[PDB]
């Protein structure tokens, strides 16, 4: 907790393989855990991300939920910040409906005084003429609720949540996300009771950069306890 007091720099690195298409994205920015603010920029190395940006919004930012403005009466239930100095491993499968599946594994830790993430992604049995492979997803990203429940056997937290993506035509694409968060450190981890984190995000594009800007300003608040 005392490490998050104030403003904390954040760096994220992901290397995904969508049906052979290998892409890498390295983003950076700032986060304020006290106010639950997260302002990041994820400029992918590839000129064009093989998949839409909203699809990887949940892989590049929701892998860092320790910045959520956990209420003081739920600060104990902040699993992420607990055992954070040692880091934690987040393995998540996203089943898109009729568009295939994402398999992702990320490691969240500190380097110096900066939060860092090592993420790896893979795409399986995709549909080329689907909403995602067709790039029909709208740039804007909706607000979503992420439900979290502690499992004692793995002394971790399993997370469930459905993500909705807006489409240019008008359809809403629903994806179901199964996630597991396991502690890397052997110290006492604060296993939380069931709670849902509300996440409200905005995507924008800066004028200057030729490469994809992927400006993301998000605010996360814990709730349900």
């Amino acid at each position: 907790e005392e490490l998050f007091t104030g403003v904390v720099p954040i760096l994220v690195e992901l290397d995904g393989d969508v049906n052979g298409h290998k892409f890498s994205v390295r983003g950076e920015g700032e986060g304020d855990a006290t106010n639950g603010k997260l302002t990041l920029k994820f400029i992918c190395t590839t000129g064009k991300l093989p998949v839409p940006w909203p699809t990887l919004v949940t892989t590049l930012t929701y892998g860092v939920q320790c910045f959520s403005r956990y209420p003081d009466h739920m600060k104990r239930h902040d699993f992420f910040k607990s055992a954070m100095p040692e880091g934690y491993v987040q393995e998540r499968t996203i089943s898109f409906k009729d568009d295939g599946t994402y398999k992702t594994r990320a490691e969240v830790k500190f380097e110096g005084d900066t939060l860092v993430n090592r993420i790896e992604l893979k795409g399986i049995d995709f549909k080329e003429d689907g909403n995602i492979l067709g790039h029909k997803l709208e740039y804007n990203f909706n607000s979503h609720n992420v439900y979290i429940t502690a499992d004692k056997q793995k002394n971790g937290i399993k997370a469930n949540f459905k993500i909705r993506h807006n489409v240019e035509d008008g359809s809403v694409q629903l994806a179901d996300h199964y996630q597991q968060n396991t502690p890397i450190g052997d110290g006492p981890v604060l296993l939380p009771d069931n709670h849902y984190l509300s996440t409200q995000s905005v995507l924008s594009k800066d004028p200057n950069e030729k490469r994809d800007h992927m400006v993301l300003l998000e605010f996360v608040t814990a709730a349900g306890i």
Partner: nanobody
Amino acid sequence: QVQLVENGGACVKPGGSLRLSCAASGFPVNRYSMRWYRQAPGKEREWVAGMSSAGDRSSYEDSVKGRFTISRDDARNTVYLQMNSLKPEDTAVYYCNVNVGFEYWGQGTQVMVS
């Protein structure tokens, strides 16, 4: 900044017709796409209808496919959605979703066939 007002929700016996009107503030309706979400009491929200930004292409769900209609009007700055024939599967609140940025949930209109 941006607010949404939904009206026209009313009770309808099967085979009737009802139109829900969603008026918008703080942004032009043409430049931005619109959607309608359906939420039953105590169940998960489900999308029903949607208009693209240009308004040329519209999409519907399979359950009410061909039985729902959706349209837009810029002079009045308001979108409309027509139920056409009603079935007891339409008993859910109808929220109007459009965000220029962020997420903006409309108040919605509560409709049910009964």
